[PDB]
Structures are given as structure tokens and as C-alpha cells.
């Protein structure tokens, strides 16, 4: 009566309950902003075939955009409109990798999948449950994307082709995550392997696209882009991602069938037996705790800034002259030129990303406290402000160095583009470093929360989101100019020419210091509760 797949549906329902909020979010948040945000935004920007042909030529005459998103094959509304949704393949890959690793590993690692296994469940119920959940999530987001696209005036066949391409891109990396989850007892190591496979697929696709295009055929990302939705659909390449998914699922089951529940197939690197000369205080400990996140975020922001430096010159010649563009880049973005008034939009979103970086590294403080590891630190000869100065120090310094390296990369790319770097690098570095008063806030906000309302510490994320909303929904619309001052990014001045008053910088720095001081003073007189 019982088989090796018993309890598959019960385990699936457990998984579905356990992420009943995150899954609907990243399914809807990755599928509905296809027709309502991308294609609508190209309709607004390029209303005629003549503009779309110029946009396609621009894209095809720039290695950076053709590498970050791929090529454009014709000037149809659908094709040009969906050329930029092409990062949704990487985003669905990230989502499915995270889901599979969360529900297969990190559930054995915590010992939950031996209490489960000790019930009436088969040997392959956990793997099949997580695989089925991720396949269903990919199919659901693809179907919702196709349903949204079919509510627009684009090619009906291309909508279905892109939806199926997104679903297949999700399924292939569901399979690779299932394979990787059998490889190591550590969930972090399996995530690293899966994301390294995803990153090398992305690199292969990017190198191929900005070139002859041959190498792009060797990456699971790229099989999705070469389906050519709205540009002449090649449906036969979808079964090229079906074979890979089937082979990797078979391999995942084969690896599962020959390993014990506790761990599998790769031992972990031992480490050291003494705590060096640097592990002797909270600063050296939080450096060890944070350096991985600093490296990841800094590399990401440097690569992100390196993208804009090459997409500045070559962003004057090609916009909707006298459209919203050239009338948006001025108001949200500062009036003046069109090259200089665009760095203010690239960096006012490399500052938002750095603000998220800061919020993460400052929420590590709340994680340490609620994880029972702060009462272990503060039961030693560690001051209550010496702790919370390490996490603040690395949060602020990491945000600063990440933003400054982003600015240096963008300035180097921009200078290499237009002749000389010596005249453009200082301006770009100034544009990057002027965002610091507004990225150090949301570190002051999180510290103010942690000390006056520790359980309402994560709401800082919402505040950040709120700011972003108040920056977009409010600055792209006729919202009043009295509640648009409630978020700090609008007040960042522009470096170049004039109109650089440096007063809002001082006000933001004072606000940041006051909030940090309130957080520290209210932590020093507060019960460390767990």
C-alpha cells in the first residue's frame, strides 16, 4: 500500500502552506508586470513603428545592452516591448533555485526532514514535493504572464511563446537546484553551486549575445531568448530545455537514491583550530559574519554601475524627443543636459540598492539579538554600544564602498566611451558619493527601530519600499509638492555646472546622526529580550 512516493501530496501541502505568502508574491510580482509595466511603457515611450525601429537599431548597435538583455530582431511592439523583460528568465531561475533549496535542503540541515521521514512518507516524497511545487510555480507564472500579454495589442503567438519560454527557464533551473540539493550537507554550499551554475549560464549567454551569438546557444538562458517571441517563434528550442530538465531531474533522483538523509557526497572543508589574531572582539567577529554579503553586494553594484557608464553616451541620440522622456528625465532627474540628467537617475537607483544593502547589514543586528547570540556576546566584557557599533560600522562602510565602487566603475565606463576618462570620472564619482546621506538613512532608521521597538525592526524594509513608491508614484504623477519631501532621494543635489547647494546633504546627515544616536541611547537602556 505504501511506496517510495507516499506522502508526496501531504508534503506538497506542507511546503505550500509554509510559503503561502512568498510564493504568490514572486509569482504575481514576476508575471503581471509584463503587459502592465513593460509593454505599456514602450507604448508610452515609442508610440510609432518609426520610433521602435530606431530603438531596435540602438539596441543592436550597443554591446552593453545587447549583452545585458539580448538582441532585438524586429521593430514590432511585442518584440521591442519584451526585449527588456528578458531578465525575467534570470529572475525566475533565482526564484525557483531558492524555493527548491529551501524546501529540500536547509530542511534536512535543520533536522526537520528526519522528523518528517519518521512519518508515513516515501523516500522520494520530499524531492518530488519540492520539484512539483517549483514546476507548478514556474508554470503558473508563465501562464499568468501569457494571460497578461494576451490583454494587449501585440502578437498573440508571441505572448504564448514568451510565457512558455519563461516557464521552461524556471523548470530547467528547478532541475539544476534539485541536482545541487543532493550535493552537500550545507544549504549554503548547495545554493552557491546552483547560483554559480546560473551565473555561468548568464555569462555564457551575455558573451554570446554581444558577439557572433554562437556561444549563447550553450546556456539554458539563451535557449529561452532564442525562442524569438514576436520575432518569429522557434518552438523547437523549447524541447531543448525540456530534455535538459528531464535529464537533470533523473540525475537528481539517481543522486537521492544513493545517499542518506543526513548528508551527501561532499564533505565540508574543516577550517582552523584557533581564532586567528583578528577574532578577538565584536568588530572582527562581525567582519567574518558580513564579508560574504559585502563581497556579493559590492560585486553586484560594481557590475551594475559598469552597465550605466556604457549606456549614457548613446542615450542622448536615442529617446522619444519631446515625449515623456526628455520631459521626465528633467523633472525627476534635474533639469539641464540629457546625459548629465541621466546619471542622476542611474545613481538614484544605485543609491536605492545600496540603501537595501545597508538595511540588510543593519538588520543583521536584529538577527543576532533574536537568534540568542547577542546575550552571549553581551554576557562577556563587551559594551552595549561597542556591540551595535560593529554592525553599524560595517553597514555604513560597506554601503559607502559599494556606492563609491559603483560610481568609479560607471565613471570609468563613461570616460572610456567618450574619448577621455579624466573629465568624466570625477563627476560620476561625485554623483555616486552624493547619494551617501540618503543610503546612510535606512541604516539610521533601522537602528532607531532596534532600540525603540525591536520587534518592529524589519518594517524598515517597508519604509524603504515606501520611499521608493513615494519616489516613483508621486514624481511620475501630478502628486503635490508638499508630500514629495518625505523621502530623501528627491533632495539629493546634482553635481555638475551649478545648483549644488549641499544644504539637503547636511540636513540628511544630521537626521542620520540624530536617529543613530536615538537608537544607541535607547538600546543602552533597554532589556535585551529573548
Amino acid at each position: 500500500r505504501g511506496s517510495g512516493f507516499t506522502g508526496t501530496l501531504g508534503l506538497l501541502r506542507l511546503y505550500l502552506r509554509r510559503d503561502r505568502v512568498s510564493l504568490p508574491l514572486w509569482v504575481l510580482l514576476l508575471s503581471v508586470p509584463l503587459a502592465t509595466v513593460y509593454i505599456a511603457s514602450v507604448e508610452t515611450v515609442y508610440p510609432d513603428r518609426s520610433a521602435r525601429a530606431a530603438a531596435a537599431a540602438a539596441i543592436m548597435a550597443s554591446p552593453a545592452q545587447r549583452a545585458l538583455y539580448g538582441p532585438v530582431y524586429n521593430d514590432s511592439l511585442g518584440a521591442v516591448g519584451i526585449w527588456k523583460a528578458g531578465m525575467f528568465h534570470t529572475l525566475i531561475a533565482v526564484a525557483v533555485i531558492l524555493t527548491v533549496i529551501r524546501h529540500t535542503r536547509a530542511d534536512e540541515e535543520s533536522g526537520r526532514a528526519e522528523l518528517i521521514d519518521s512519518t508515513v512518507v516515501g523516500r522520494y516524497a520530499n524531492l518530488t514535493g519540492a520539484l512539483l511545487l517549483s514546476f507548478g510555480a514556474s508554470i503558473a507564472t508563465g501562464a499568468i504572464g501569457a494571460l497578461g500579454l494576451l490583454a494587449t495589442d501585440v502578437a498573440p503567438a508571441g505572448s504564448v511563446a514568451f510565457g512558455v519560454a519563461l516557464a521552461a527557464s524556471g523548470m530547467v533551473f528547478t532541475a539544476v537546484a534539485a541536482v545541487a540539493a543532493q550535493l552537500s550537507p550545507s544549504a549554503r554550499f548547495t545554493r552557491a553551486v546552483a547560483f554559480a551554475v546560473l551565473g555561468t549560464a548568464f555569462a555564457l549567454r551575455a558573451i554570446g549575445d554581444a558577439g557572433s551569438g554562437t556561444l549563447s546557444w550553450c546556456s539554458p538562458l539563451g535557449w529561452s531568448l532564442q525562442v524569438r517571441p514576436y520575432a518569429g517563434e522557434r518552438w523547437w528550442v523549447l524541447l531543448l530545455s525540456l530534455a535538459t530538465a528531464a535529464v537533470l531531474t533523473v540525475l537528481a533522483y539517481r543522486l537521492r537514491a544513493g545517499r542518506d538523509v543526513g548528508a551527501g557526497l561532499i564533505a565540508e572543508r574543516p577550517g582552523a583550530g584557533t581564532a586567528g589574531p583578528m577574532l578577538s572582539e565584536p568588530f572582527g567577529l562581525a567582519w567574518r559574519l558580513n564579508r560574504g554579503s559585502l563581497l556579493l553586494w559590492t560585486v553586484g553594484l560594481c557590475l551594475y554601475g559598469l552597465v550605466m557608464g556604457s549606456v549614457v553616451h548613446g542615450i542622448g541620440d536615442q529617446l522619444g524627443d519631446n515625449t515623456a522622456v526628455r520631459d521626465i528625465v528633467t523633472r525627476m532627474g534635474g533639469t539641464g543636459a540629457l546625459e548629465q540628467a541621466f546619471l542622476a537617475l542611474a545613481f538614484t537607483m544605485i543609491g536605492m540598492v545600496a540603501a537595501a544593502f545597508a538595511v540588510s547589514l543593519t538588520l543583521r543586528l536584529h538577527q543576532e539579538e533574536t537568534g540568542l547570540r547577542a546575550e552571549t556576546l553581551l554576557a562577556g566584557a563587551v559594551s552595549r554600544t561597542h556591540w551595535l557599533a560593529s554592525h553599524l560600522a560595517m553597514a555604513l562602510a560597506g554601503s559607502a564602498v559599494a556606492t563609491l565602487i559603483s560610481g568609479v566603475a560607471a565613471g570609468l565606463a563613461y570616460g572610456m566611451t567618450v574619448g577621455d576618462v579624466g573629465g568624466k570620472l570625477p563627476t560620476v564619482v561625485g554623483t555616486a558619493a552624493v547619494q551617501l546621506p540618503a543610503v546612510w538613512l535606512l541604516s539610521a532608521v533601522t537602528v532607531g527601530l532596534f532600540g525603540l521597538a525591536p520587534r518592529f525592526t524589519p518594517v524598515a524594509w517597508g519604509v524603504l519600499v515606501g520611499f521608493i513608491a513615494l519616489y516613483l508614484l508621486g514624481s511620475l504623477a501630478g502628486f503635490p509638492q508638499m508630500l514629495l519631501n518625505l523621502e530623501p532621494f528627491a533632495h539629493i543635489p546634482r553635481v555638475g555646472g551649478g545648483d549644488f547647494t549641499a544644504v539637503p546633504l547636511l540636513w540628511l546627515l544630521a537626521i542620520d546622526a540624530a536617529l543613530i544616536t536615538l537608537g544607541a541611547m535607547a538600546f543602552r537602556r533597554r532589556d535585551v529580550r529573548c
Binding site: G2, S3, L14, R18, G111, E114, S118, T119
Partner: protein, 211 residues
């Protein structure tokens, strides 16, 4: 004979003989399973469940073998882990009732009184539970279930002496409904209070056994 192992052997790295010539026999009683941490008690409990396969010897769980018949035999069995992280987003009652729609069945009449006298609050999320309250969830889920065999593994870890006494009385009540128990304690006071016919293992072998 619910459990009958004699001759069990297993090498993990194939440089770490955890098990060589292990023996155990249980008949409807409470049995104490004593030894240090590296002696192979955890390996024996995970071989009794289908989790790990043995290299040699005979293992006989409730008539069938644990490897092939790991789904049909797990319905008459309850298990308390030596350490489990419980899902942080689920409440205590949700966790208790889920581990029951997977062991197969629960007894609501026993569940209500167990929650009443262990003093658990089955509405807080499992992330907020302390060390003592995390063990109560597993104990209530295992002691209120149709299970002719209980595999406990450090059942009372983090429990104050009052809840220790309540747990001992609950085991005493269960023992006269015909339920066979394995304790595997590490605390010899409760083993002496509850169990008769202990068995002590040193490296892979059983160096002592009896009442």
C-alpha cells in the same frame, strides 16, 4: 517482538566502524538504551527508520524489515528526535496536528489533556518558543497518537523537574495500554525510574544487557 537486532554492522566512511555486532531485543516493555555519543545509538535509531541502510546483520522491526517496508511500518510508530528545528512560521497546534496527518491519526481526548497539563500555548508561532516549550510540541505530538511503538531519543531535554515528573507519569500510563517504549535517555535517573532491562553499548557492540 517489536525489535530484534543481532549482528548489525555498518561502516560509514568505510574508515569509521560505527556498528559491529550489535544486539537488542524488545517485547512490549520499556527498554533503556545506554552509551556515549559516538557509540552508535543514533545510527541504530536511524537504521530502524528507513533513513540509513545496514551493511550486515538482521534487523527486524515489527516483523518486516525497516528498509523496504519503511512506509507500511511507520504508521504504528512514533518518534521523538534528539534535536529538531520546528518550522518557524507554524504555531504549536498547527505543528502538532500536521505531524498527525502524516503519522496517520491523533487522539483529541488525550491531546487536550496533554496540552492542559504540559502547560503549552498552541497559538504562538514556533519561532517564539523557548527551549522548554519546543520539546513539549514533540512530546505532545508523539504521546497523543495511535502508536504501538515509541522511539524516544533524549525525550526530556530542557524540561524542569515538574514537567519531568509529568512526562514520567504519562509514560507510566502509556505502558499499561500495551505500548512498547525505547528511551535512549543520557539521564540515568529517569532511566532507573522508568526502565527495566537496560542495555549498555561501548563502541559498536553491546557490552552489557539485562534487568
Amino acid at each position: 517482538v517489536p525489535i530484534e537486532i543481532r549482528g548489525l554492522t555498518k561502516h560509514f566512511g568505510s574508515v569509521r566502524a560505527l556498528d559491529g555486532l550489535d544486539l537488542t531485543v524488545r517485547e512490549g516493555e520499556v527498554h533503556g538504551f545506554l552509551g556515549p555519543n559516538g557509540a552508535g545509538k543514533s545510527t541504530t535509531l536511524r537504521i530502524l527508520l528507513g533513513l540509513v541502510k545496514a551493511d550486515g546483520g538482521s534487523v527486524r522491526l515489527l516483523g518486516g524489515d525497516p528498509w523496504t517496508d519503511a512506509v507500511d511500518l511507520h504508521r504504528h510508530i512514533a518518534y521523538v528526535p534528539g534535536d529538531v528545528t520546528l518550522w518557524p512560521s507554524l504555531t504549536g497546534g498547527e505543528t502538532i496536528d500536521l505531524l498527525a496527518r502524516m503519522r496517520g491519526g491523533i487522539d483529541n481526548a488525550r491531546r487536550a489533556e496533554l496540552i492542559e497539563r504540559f502547560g503549552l500555548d498552541p497559538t504562538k508561532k514556533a519561532r517564539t518558543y523557548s527551549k522548554g516549550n519546543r520539546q513539549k510540541v514533540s512530546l505532545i505530538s508523539a504521546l497523543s497518537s495511535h502508536a504501538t511503538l515509541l522511539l524516544l531519543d533524549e525525550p526530556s531535554s530542557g524540561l524542569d523537574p515538574l514537567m519531568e515528573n509529568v512526562f514520567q507519569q504519562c509514560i507510566g500510563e502509556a505502558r499499561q495500554r500495551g505500548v512498547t517504549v525505547l528511551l535512549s535517555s543520557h539521564i540515568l535517573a529517569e532511566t532507573e525510574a522508568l526502565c527495566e532491562k537496560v542495555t549498555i553499548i561501548r563502541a559498536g557492540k553491546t557490552v552489557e544487557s539485562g534487568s
